[PDB]
Paper text:
In this study, we describe the biochemical and structural behavior of the three most common mutants: R367Q, R238W, and L375F. Crystals of all three cN-II mutants belonged to the I222 space group with one molecule per asymmetric unit. Overall, the spatial arrangements of the mutants were almost identical to that of the wild type. The L375F mutation is located in alpha-helix 13 (amino acid residues 375–381), which interacts with a 3/10 helix (amino acid residues 485–487) in the neighboring subunit. Introduction of F375 induced a closer contact between the mutated residue and H486 of the adjacent subunit, which was accompanied by a slight displacement of the proximal L379 side chain. Consequently, this led to rearrangement of other surrounding interactions at the oligomeric interface; i.e., the NE1 atom of W382 formed a hydrogen bond with the carbonyl group of H486 in the mutant and with the D487 carbonyl in the wild type. Our data show that the L375F mutation causes local changes at intersubunit contacts. On the other hand, the R238W and L375F mutations stimulated catalytic activity in synergy with ATP binding and caused a decrease in protein thermostability. Interestingly, interface A also includes helix A (amino acid residues 355–365), which was well defined in all the mutant crystal structures. Helix A is formed only in the active state of the cN-II enzyme, and the stabilization of this region in the mutants is consistent with their high catalytic potency even in the absence of ATP.
Numbering used by the authors:
A (entry chain A), B (entry chain A), C (entry chain A), D (entry chain A): 3 to 402, 417 to 488
Amino acid sequence: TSWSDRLQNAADMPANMDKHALKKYRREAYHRVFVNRSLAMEKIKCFGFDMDYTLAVYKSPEYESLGFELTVERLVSIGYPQELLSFAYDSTFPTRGLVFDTLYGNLLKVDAYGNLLVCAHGFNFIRGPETREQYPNKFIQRDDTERFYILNTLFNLPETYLLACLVDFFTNCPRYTSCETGFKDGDLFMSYRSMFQDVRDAVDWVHYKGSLKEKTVENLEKYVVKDGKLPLLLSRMKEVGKVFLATNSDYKYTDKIMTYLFDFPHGPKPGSSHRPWQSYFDLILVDARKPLFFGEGTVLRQVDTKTGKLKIGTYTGPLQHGIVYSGGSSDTICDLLGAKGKDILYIGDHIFGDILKSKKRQGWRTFLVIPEFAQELHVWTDKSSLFEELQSLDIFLAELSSIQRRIKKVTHDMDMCYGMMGSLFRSGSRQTLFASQVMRYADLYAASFINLLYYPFSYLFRAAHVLMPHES
Amino acid sequence: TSWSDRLQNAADMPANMDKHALKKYRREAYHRVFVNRSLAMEKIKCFGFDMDYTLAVYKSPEYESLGFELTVERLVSIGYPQELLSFAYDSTFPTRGLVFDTLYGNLLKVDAYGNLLVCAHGFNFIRGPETREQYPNKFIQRDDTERFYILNTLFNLPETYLLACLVDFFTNCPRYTSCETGFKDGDLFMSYRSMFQDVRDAVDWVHYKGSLKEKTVENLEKYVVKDGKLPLLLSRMKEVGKVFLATNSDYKYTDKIMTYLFDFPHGPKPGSSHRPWQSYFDLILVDARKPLFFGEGTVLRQVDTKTGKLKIGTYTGPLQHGIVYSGGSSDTICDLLGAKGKDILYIGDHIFGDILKSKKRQGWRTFLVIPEFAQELHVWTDKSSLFEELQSLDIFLAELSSIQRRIKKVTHDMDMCYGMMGSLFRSGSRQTLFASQVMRYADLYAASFINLLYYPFSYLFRAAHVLMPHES
Amino acid sequence: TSWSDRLQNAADMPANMDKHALKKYRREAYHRVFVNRSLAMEKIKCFGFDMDYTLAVYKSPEYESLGFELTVERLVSIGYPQELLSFAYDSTFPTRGLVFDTLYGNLLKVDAYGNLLVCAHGFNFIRGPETREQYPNKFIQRDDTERFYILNTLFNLPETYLLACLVDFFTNCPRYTSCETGFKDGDLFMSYRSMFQDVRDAVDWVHYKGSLKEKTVENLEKYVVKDGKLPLLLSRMKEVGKVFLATNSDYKYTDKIMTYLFDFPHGPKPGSSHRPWQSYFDLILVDARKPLFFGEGTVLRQVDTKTGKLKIGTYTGPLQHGIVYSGGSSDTICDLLGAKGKDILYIGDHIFGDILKSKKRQGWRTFLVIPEFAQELHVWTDKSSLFEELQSLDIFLAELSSIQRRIKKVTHDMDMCYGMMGSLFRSGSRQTLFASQVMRYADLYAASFINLLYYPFSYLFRAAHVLMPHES
Amino acid sequence: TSWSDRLQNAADMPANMDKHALKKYRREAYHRVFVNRSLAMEKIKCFGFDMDYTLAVYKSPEYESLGFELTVERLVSIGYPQELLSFAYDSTFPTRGLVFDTLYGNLLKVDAYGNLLVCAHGFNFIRGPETREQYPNKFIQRDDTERFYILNTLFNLPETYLLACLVDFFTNCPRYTSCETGFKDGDLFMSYRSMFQDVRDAVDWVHYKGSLKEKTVENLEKYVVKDGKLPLLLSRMKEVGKVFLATNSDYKYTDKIMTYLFDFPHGPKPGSSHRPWQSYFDLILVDARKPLFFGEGTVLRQVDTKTGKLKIGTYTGPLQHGIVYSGGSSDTICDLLGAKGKDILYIGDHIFGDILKSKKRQGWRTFLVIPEFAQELHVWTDKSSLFEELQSLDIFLAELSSIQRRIKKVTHDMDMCYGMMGSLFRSGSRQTLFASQVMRYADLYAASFINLLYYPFSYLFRAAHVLMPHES
C-alpha cells in the first residue's frame, strides 16, 4: 500500500457534511490539518493552489516509474550504456529531500544544520567512521550549490533512485575504474558531477520535450488520483472567498488534467449539474515560473483558450470573466483580487520553493500538502513504541557503552520501516532538513488539502507559542 | 542600573570554586548558561573567542554615548546643521535588532517572518491602522537589503538612536518640508536613504579613522568591564583544550584592550604570578575580516609584534609559539589547531554575523554572549506576572472585543518596562527576529561567557528534542 | 546575379597551377587576398577553419529565403497573425551589420562611433531631421546590449528583413494602434522589444529544433556552393602545415555537409583517388561553442563517429588518428597541435565573433571570408566614378549650400546600387562599423578563402605601416 | 629639458593675436593641433575641461619625484624595508602606458594587439628569446585585468618606476630568494601581485589621505605650470560658446589650483581687470567620479563655496550663477547647458578614461592633451633620419640575415633617445597601444590645449578619409 493508495481510498469515500460526523472525522490523524503557526480561517479571503502534486496527485509508484523509465531511455538515447535498460524503479529506496554530493557521488540525508544522518554510495550504506574519510566533520555546507543538489520535489524521486543505480552500475562494471570523484575508462573520465548533470538534463528533457505528459494524459486513471470531494471543497471555498490557480504548467496540460479532475457526472455534490473546472476559479494563471513569480516574475500574458497559444502583447487590462493569464507575478494576484498577502492561503507541495518563497517574499499564509504523509503517518503510529523506546534510551544515556549500540540498532530498525532512506522527517531521534523547513514555513500541513473540508468556515487553527529557554 | 552595571557587579566577586558553591551559583538565572541544542563539553577540544563585546564588554551607556557624540560631531563636520550638537544619547530609546526602512524613514521591530511589531517615525510610535498606509500587509521583505538595514550589533545602538533623532529634527525644523521619502529644502531634497548612508558612513569613520579607539584606550576604566575571573576561566579552558582569539580588530588595539583585561596584580588566581595576555592563547588572529573569514577569508599574514605592522609576505609556515596571525580564514584555525568544526566552541556576541556564519558555513558549536541579557533577565523575572496575564488572555480569547484592548494595554505596559522599543526578545507574546536567530544559531547563550566557570569540565548541556505537530 | 552566383561561377573553373597563370589570376580584384596587417605565410604552421559560411557557403537568396519562411511559419505557429504567411523574402532590403533598436523599432546603419548613417522604421527611411526626434545626437551607445542588437552574421539576414516586415505590417494593420515603443490592441500591448525577442527565439528554434538543417541536407545542390578546388587547396595546406576544423555545428550535420563538399569523382585533383573529408584534417572539433571556446571553453569530449553520439567521459588522451573531438577550447588546439597562436591562421566569416575573439583573446592570425564581397566588389568597381565624384565634392566643400544637396544625392544614388540598406562597408563617404571591424581584426580578407590557392607557399602579404598625424 | 620645461617656455611668451602671426605660429609642429577625425569648430557650442594634467600641468620631474618619495615613505611606514628610502626617482626610466604583469613581475610595452615590444624585469631588459619562456606567443591578453594593470595616467609614472625599483631591490637583496612569481623569505612569500597591490594602495593613499596635495599647494610655483594665455583662450571660448569644468578633484583643491592658475595682475589680457577663475565657467562640477560620470554617475550635489562642504540634499534645481555642482553625470552637463554630445569638445589628458568613455558612451568630441608630447615631438623631429632609415630597411627586407640585426640596432638606438622604455607612441616601426588609442578616440590632440589659441573661431580641422585595402 503506497501513499497514493491511501489518498485514493479516502478519495473514494463520499462527504458526510453533518457537523458531528465532520468533528468525528478530523479527530483521526489521517484527516487532520496539523498547525505550526496559529491561523484564523475567518481572515483568509483568497485560497490559491498549485496543480501538480497538489490538485493533481500522481499515483505511486506508477508515475515515478514512468518518469524513471523515460529518463533511462533518454540517457541511453544520448549514449549511456544499454545495461541501463535493465534497471527498474524501486520505490523502497528513495526518500524525498536527499542531497546528491557531486564531488564523491553520495546520497546524503542531513539535518537542518547539514549534519550527516545517512550516507549511501550507490547501494552501499556507509557507516559512521568510514564517513569521516570524506566528511571529516560529518557535515556539509548545503548552500554550496555548485557541489550539492537537494532533491526536494516528488519529481526528483526517480532521479534519486537513478543516481544510486548509476553509481552502483559503474562501480561494478569491469570496464570502469572507480576513482574518488568519478570513473575512468582509459582516456575518458566521467566525473560524478558530469553524470549528475546528464541525469538532471535528462529528467528536464523528459518533462519538457519528451513523452511524459503525453503518456500521462493518455491514461489518467492509471496516473492521477481523482476525488469527488475536490469540487465540493473548492465550491465551499468560493462561498467565503476568492479561489485562484497559479501553476508552472502550460494551459494545454493544465486543461487536460483539470478536466479529468472534475470529470464526474455531477458538479460540487451528487445530483448537482456538472460545471467546467474553470468555473471554480476567480483567477487562473499558468506558466507561472515560480519561484521567480514571487519576485519580479515575467511579463503578464493572456492565453487564447481556443488555441492554447498566447495572445500577442502584454496584458494591461482588468480581471475579467473567462480570461486565463500566463506569467505575471505574485503581485498580479494581489492586484487583481484586491488581496494583501495575509489574506491569502496558498496551497502547494513545493516546500523549498512555493511555500518558503511565498512566505518569505510576500507574507502569504501557507498550507503544505505532503503526499507521502498518508503513508508516513501509518508507519509513525504503528511504530510509536520504537520511537518511545528511543526517547527513553536518549534520556537514560544523558543522565549517565552498551546503551549507544542499542540506540544505533533501534534507530536502524525504526528507519527501515519507512524505506531504505528512512522517514521524510527524521532518522531516529534526529529531524531532517525537510522536517525543519516544514515547521518553519508551512503554517498548516497535511497529506492532502482535502482535509480542510472537515473544518468549519471560520475555524481557528491553534499552535502553542514558542518560548526561549530562559523564558520557559 | 544598566546591563553593564550588572556585569561589573558580578565581575567584582571573587570565584568560589568549591563544587557545591558552583552548583548553587549556576542555579541562579543570572549565572546560568541557557541551551538551545544539547552540547557535551567533553567533546569540545578548542575554545575560540571574539574580542569586542565578548572579552571586552564596553560599559553602558557611556560607550554608546561616546560613539553617539563622535558620530554627531562627524556629521556636523561634513555639513549637517549645528543643532545636531544639542542631541544627547538616551539609552531608554534603542533596542538592538531594529530595522531602518530607508524608504519611509521608520525604525521597525519585526518578528522572524517580517511582521511589524513596532513602527516609529522619529519619536512618533505609529499605531496599527496608520501603519497600513505604508505597510499594507504589516510586513517587510527583510532581505531587500537595498531598502532595509538591520541594526544587529551593539555598535549600532548609537546610530539607532541617531536615526530617530534626525528624523525628529528634520520633521520639526521649519526650514524643511516633510515628504513621504525625505525632506525638501527648496531645490535640495534629502532622502531618508541618503541620510541613512551619511549616518552609516559617519559611524564607520568614527571607528576606523576618528578618535573612538583613542578616547576608549585613554580611559579604559570608564569604558571597559574588567573581571578578575577572566584569566581563571581561560586558564581552566587551556587545561582541557586549546584556546584561540579571532578578532576583526587590529593588533595595536587588541593589545591595549587585552593588556587592560589582564592587568591585575596576579595571574589566573590571586597569589599567582601575572602572565601576559598572549600566554592564554594557543593561537591569536587579528584583522579576521569576519564574516568573509568563514568563507574564502583573506591572505594569511604575520604581525611583527614589536612594531604592530605586518611582516612582508603571506605566511606559509606552521603554528609557532609567540606568532600572531592576521587575516586568513576559519580553515587556518582548523588546520593549525588540528580541529574539526564540532570540536570548536566559538564564543561571540555577533549573532547574525560570527555565530550564524560559523554554524552554517563550518558546523562550529556556538556560544552567544548577549550583554544586555543581564538587564533583560531582571525585567523578565520582575514582570513575569504581566507575561503570565498576557498568556492567559491569549488562551482565553482563542477559546472564544474587550479582551483585545486589554491584550494591547498589557502588551504596551510590559514592553515599556524594557525601554521604548521593548525587549530584545519580544513584543508582548510575539518573538522578535533576534530571538528567533538566537534560538536557531546559538547552541548556548548567556549574558557573559564567564558563566561557563560555574559548570564542570565535562558537563552535558541538555535541551529537549523538538517534535513536529503530528509527532507530539 | 547574387554573391553566391559569383562564388559558384568561380567554383566551376578548374585550377590552372602554372605559376604565371596564378600570378595573372590574383591580379584580378575578385581573386585577390586583401591585407590589413602584414602576414608572412612561411610562419603559419596551422590552418584552421569554421564550417558554416566559410567552407560551406550557402546559396543566396535561396538559403536566406528558406530560413525566412521557416521563421515565419514558427511565429504563426506560436500565435502571430496569418497575414505573416503572405510575406516573401526580398534580398534587396537587408545589408548585414544593421542594429535593431528595440526601443523604437528601427533598423539603424551606424559607423564605428555609433553615428547614424541610415534609419528605417519598417520600410520608411527616415530623413535626417526626423531622426533627431528619437536620436537627438544622431548617435547610439551600441554596447547598450539591452536595447540594441547588432545583426552581424549572415544567419541574421532573414530576421533583418523579417523585423522590417513586422514593423510595417503592424503599423499598417488597422487592428493595432502605433505607439512610440510598440503597438496597442485594446488591453494588449506588444512592445518592439517583445516582438524582437519572439523573432530571435524563432530563428534560434528553426536552427536548433526546426526543419532548417533537414531541408538543407535534402537538397544540398540548391543550398550549398560546391567547388572542386576546395580539396586541392586543403591538400596543399597540409603539405606545409597542419589543418584543423573548429565548428559550432554538431557532428551529424558537419558530416553531411562536409561529405557533400568533397563529393567529386576524384580527390585533391582530377584523376586522383577520392579521399574522405576527414582525411584533410589533422584535428576535427565540433560543438565548439565559440566564442566561449576562446576563453574557458567547455569540457573536451570525444564523438563516437559510428553513432554520432558523444562517448561517456571527458577526454584526457592525446591527439590520435581518426578521433573527432567535441567542445574543449582554443587551448585544446594549441596543445594537441603544438602551436602558439601566431603560428595559426584561422579562417572564418564571423568577424564580431570568431575573428575578433581569436585575435583579441589568443593572438591568432586571421583570415575573414566575406561571402557578399563577390557582389560588393562588382558594384564598387562599376560605380567607382560615383565614389570619385563624392570624394571631389567633399574636398571641394572643405576648401570652402548647393554642394551639400549634391553630396546627399550622389550618396543616395551610390548606396542604392548595393541595395536598400547600401554597402556592407559604407554609406557614401562614411565607413560602417562592420568596415572598421574588418580593418581592425581581419589580418587578411576576401570573398572566399579559396583565393589563397593563387598565392605561393611562403608569400609575404604586405600592408603599409600606419602613422600618426604628427608622424606623417 | 623636461616636457614641462618646454610647456613653461611656451607659457612665458605673450600672445600675438595678429592673424598672420597666428597663422605663422601654428605652422610650427610644437604649436599645432593634430587631427585624427575632421572637426568643424563652428559646430562646437560647449568647451569642457578636466583640471589635473589638462588645465593644471604638473612640472616634471619634480611632481613625479614628490609622488614617488611620499609613496616610498608610505610603504616604509607600513612595514617595507628601510632600504626603500635610498631609492630616488629617475625620469629616464618610465614611459607612460606600460603594463605591469602581476604574475611574473615584468613591465611590458605592448602594441594594440597585445604583442610584446619591450619586457623588463626590474632593470633587466629581457631579449626576445628569453621572453618566450614566460610569453610563449610574445602576447598578453591585456583585458585579463586580474593579471595585468595598464599604467595609463601621468599619476602612474612614479609607481611605474617604483615597481621596477622594488623588483630590482628584492632580486638583489640576499634575504630574499627569487622565485617565478615573487620572493621567498623563509615562511613568508611575497608574490609580485601582493607587492603590486601594496604599491597601488600606497599611491592611492598618498593622493587621498597623505600629504601630496598639501605639499603641492604650499609650493605651486615649483609644481604647476602657469601660463598667462590660459585666461585669454578661455575668455575667447566663452565669446562663442559655453565653458565647463568637470573634475574628479574636490572643491577645496580645485579652488587652490585654479586660483593659482589665474593669479596674474590682469584678466584675459594685460591691462584688463583680474576676474575670479569661476567667472570663466558657465558650469563648474567637482567630485565628478569619471568614468562612472559618463554612465549612471552619482547623485547631483551642490557645494557650499563658503565652507567647501556639500549642502544637505540632492540638488534638483536649474543652472544658476555662482552655483558649484558635485557628482552628477555627463547628462547633467547636457541638460543644464542645453547641449547634445557632438556640440561638446571635451579637453583632457586621460585617454583610456575620460576621452575614450566620453566618445564611446556619449559621442562627445574630444581633444587629448599629451603633456609629454612637447618633448616627444623634439625627439621625433631631431631623430627623423633614424626613423627614415628604419622605414627603408623594413621596405628593403620585404622585397627580399644581416638586415634584421641592423633593424634591431637602429630600433634600439632610436628608442633610447626617448628614454629606457622608449617613445610613448612606438618602439621602432611598431606602434604602441597608447598610440592606437589616441588615433581611435582623440579627434584632436596636442601637447597643450593652449594651441587652440592659434586657430580661428570657425576653423575646420581636416583629416583624410580612411579607405579599406580593396577601396584604395
